[PDB]
Design a protein around this nucleic acid. Sequence first.
DNA 1: ACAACAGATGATGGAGCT
DNA 2: GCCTTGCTTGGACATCTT
DNA 3: AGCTCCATCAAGCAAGGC
DNA 4: AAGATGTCCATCTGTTGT
Lengths: 165, 159
Amino acid sequence: HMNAGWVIGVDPDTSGALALLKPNQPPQVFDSPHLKVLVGVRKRLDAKAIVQLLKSFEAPIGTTVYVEQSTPYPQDGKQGWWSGGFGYGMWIGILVASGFSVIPVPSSAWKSEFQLTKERSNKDYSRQVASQLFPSLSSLLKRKKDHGRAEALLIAAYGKGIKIN
Amino acid sequence: GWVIGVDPDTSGALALLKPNQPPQVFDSPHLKVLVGKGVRKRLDAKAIVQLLKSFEAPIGTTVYVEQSTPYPQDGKQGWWSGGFGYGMWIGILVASGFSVIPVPSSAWKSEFQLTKERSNKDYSRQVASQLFPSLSSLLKRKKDHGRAEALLIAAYGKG
DNA sequence: ACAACAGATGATGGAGCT
DNA sequence: GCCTTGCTTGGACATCTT
DNA sequence: AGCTCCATCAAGCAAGGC
DNA sequence: AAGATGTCCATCTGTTGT
Ligand SMILES: [Mg+2]
Ligand SMILES: [Mg+2]
């Protein structure tokens, strides 16, 4: 049956974001909190700020959350393979440990519902798509670096349409 | 008062040191996921959460987690699994209210001496079964490296 | 400083010394 | 079956096409 | 702060041995 | 049931441009 609860979508990359769709209320989008961690320095997801961001929502138990399940290319550096596994594994861990119902979503699935093929590609037009589905947040999607916000929104609007049990 | 040590890899362990109760080690629960062709073993986050909750440890108990630092020669997939296990344990632990402290693999050497010569083929399992003779039974097979590693991280944290 | 862009795809931690 | 050893170090996923 | 060394794994998948 | 085919990302580091 059709999901009437709260729907969250997560772009788990280190410049990713989380979108929160409540029924009958305006959509919201949040950039993922990060840290300067010395390794010199790079960005890691901030688990502590994430959990307190999730705590702030005060969502019901078992609220469904759709997490993009992404898969680096053979030519991407091993460091990026590591970071990829880290953000994904941290997001699942926090969400599962926080009582959310977690659904991984292949990148192809949500891009499929919104007709983001080679022509009119997701990188060049996903922000625009998110804008016209959620006009109230189009101010936060006016920049290239906001690609993450847009994906989180479209992952959420994808999962919203998935019938549940 | 309580000390937990965690080896975060796909066949790692978690060790739990209580005051006035014997020490304990647990294998990390895993499920089987289907990636590409064949199946991969991943940490089961649902089961880990249940495990921690069963401990009934004080709020904000300190958990030492071994840092994942793979070699250049290692495959990309193993870099990814490394980051995954590490980030998942960190996620679960922080969200469950524990206090996480990352520990490098070499950190326990400073307290208990280890060297490239006379390398740990089975050396780790010996140091842990010395320090925790209660559990010498569950350390007698090579597969039990991860349990020894969890214990030894725990003993570093405690010390 | 913040952003957009271009290009390759990459170890890391630590102790001793300058 | 499970345990150990030896070896490289690695795409995943959906869609056509036999 | 720099900069020399130098030590630290693991995943994943075939075979054998039991 | 397979097998070949197609089509998807991103990190991390400098460099340029607001
Ligand atoms: Mg992504
Ligand atoms: Mg280890």
